[PDB]
Structure formats: C-alpha cells, structure tokens
Structure 1
Amino acid sequence: GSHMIYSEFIMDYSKLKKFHGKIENAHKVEEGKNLSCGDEVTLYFLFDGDKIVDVKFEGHGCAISQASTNVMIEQIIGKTKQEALEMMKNAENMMLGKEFDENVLGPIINFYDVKNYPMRVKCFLLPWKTLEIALK
C-alpha cells in the first residue's frame, strides 16, 4: 500500500528467512551491543582465509534492522573482510549524511531515505556496527 519509511524493498527484505540461524563450529561470533533499544543481532561467520563464505544471524529485531541485516549479509557473502569493512564505512557514511560511494553499496542504497529518520538510523546500523567490531 502507500507508506513512508516502510518501502517495498524494506518490507521484502524484512521477511527474508534465508540467513536465519547459527553456524555450528563458527570461526567468529559477535553479539551486538544494545545501543538500538532492544533490536538484537548475533552474527555467525564462516571465513575460508581472508574472504567470507557464509553468514547467519539470530535475534529479535525491527523490520528495518532485520532488512538491513539481510541485505548486509547478502552483499558481504564472497568478499574480503576489507571488501566489506569499506561497504560498512560507506553504509555508515550514507546514514550520517556524508559523502559515500554509490557503487560499493549496490542495493544498500535502497536504505537511503532511512537517513531522514534520526531515531531509526540505529536500527539500520546495528548489524553493520556489529560486523565492524566482529572483524578487528
């Protein structure tokens, strides 16, 4: 229907199940801080050297944080940790209203409008700020 923040892309990726779960015997596991008022992400990675093979997550979340998470995962599968921490910085840059690179982000750009909601930025960033801390 008509909407404001909850765009067709956000609603579609909020309902995605593909990445829901944990990995048994994981090369990394990072719980997100609760800087987002009770949105939770815990990320489970398989690596294979310096690249990123598989990602999964659990946690109760927001339509926006869930969508942000699903899209984040889907764009860092098959990419280097730095070929991912730079998306992260652009993702963040977009959100804080700074210059950023459109092409690096790919379909993450569909979260642009969320920059216009100060109090929903945290929901978008949660998985990204968790992915940052998970890789340092």
Structure 2
Amino acid sequence: GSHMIYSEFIMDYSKLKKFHGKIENAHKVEEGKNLSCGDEVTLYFLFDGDKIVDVKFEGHGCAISQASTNVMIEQIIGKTKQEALEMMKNAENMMLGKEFDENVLGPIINFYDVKNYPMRVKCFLLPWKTLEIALK
C-alpha cells in the first residue's frame, strides 16, 4: 500500500553482509548521515594509487540506503577513483531526471524507480555522496 518501493532487488541487496565491517588502517574513512530519515554509513577504503582496492561500510539505515551502499561497493571495487566518480555523477543524474549513461551504471539502474519517491532519493544518494566527498 505504500511500501511498493521495496523490490526484490532492493531487499536482496539490503541484507547482503559481505561488505559490512571496518577495514583496519583504512587509507580513508568517511561518515555520512541522511538525518531526514535517520540513515548513517561509514565507508572504509583501501586504494592502490588511483585504484579502489577494497571498500567496506559500517552503520545502518533503511533498506534503500543499505541496498544502495552494497550495489555501490560491488560496482566500484577494482575501479579507479575517476571511474567511481563518473559512476557517482551518473547515479545522481539518474535521480535528478537529467541524462545518464546506462552502460556506466549497470545494475545501479535497478534504483531508477526510487526517483518516484522524492524523500527516498536521499536514502539512495547517501553512500554516493559519501563516496564523492571521500574521493576528493
């Protein structure tokens, strides 16, 4: 009745635990919060030059923010920081109704419907904006 946003894809990725945790002696730690809804995420990174070698997250939030965090990590590991930022910008364009590169986003496109729920847009965007700040 008002929970339609929660697709099978979102609920699967929300419960994924493989990227949840801390990285000891991380090269970068970045905390983000979407206090409108009450979500928090802490991203931990290892880099090798400009390559993202590993990412884990701590904290917890709604199923949209957690699903988004997990699909984000799964897609940015092994990429360069520039590539992850290009992906981020496209993820944000997708929510703002602007134009985006489907090939760049891959399975991130499964969050397309979130843009129909303007408060949950912040939930989807939290890990990505957190990533943006961290990588600059």
Does TM, normalized by the shorter one, top 0.5? Answer: yes
Moved more, 29-38 or 66-75: 29-38
What is the deviation of 1:3? 6.2
Extract unaligned runs of 5+ from structure 1.
none
Compute the TM-score of the two structures, normalised by the length of structure 2: 0.95
Moved more, 121-130 or 35-44: 35-44
Residue 100 of structure 1 aligns with which residue? Answer: 100
Please tell me whether the aligned partners of residues 52 and 81 of structure 1 are also in contact (alpha carbons under 8 angstroms): yes
What is the deviation of 1:96? 1.0
Q: Deviations over 1:65-93 (max 9, x none)?
A: 00000000000000000010010000000
CA RMSD of aligned residues (A): 1.7
The count of aligned residue pairs is: 136
Structure 1 runs of 4+ with >4 Å offset: none
Does 1:35 find its partner at 2:35? yes
Please tell me whether the aligned partners of residues 35 and 122 of structure 1 are also in contact (alpha carbons under 8 angstroms): no
Q: 1:58 to 1:83 in 2, by over 3 A?
A: same
Distance 2:89 2:132 in 1: 9
Please tell me whether the aligned partners of residues 72 and 128 of structure 1 are also in contact (alpha carbons under 8 angstroms): yes
Task: State the identity as a percent.
Answer: 100
Q: 1:83 to 1:36 in 2, by over 3 A?
A: farther
What is the deviation of 1:33? 3.8
Extract unaligned runs of 5+ from structure 2.
none
What is the deviation of 1:38? 1.5
Compute the TM-score of the two structures, normalised by the length of structure 1: 0.95
> Match of 1:41, SS?
strand
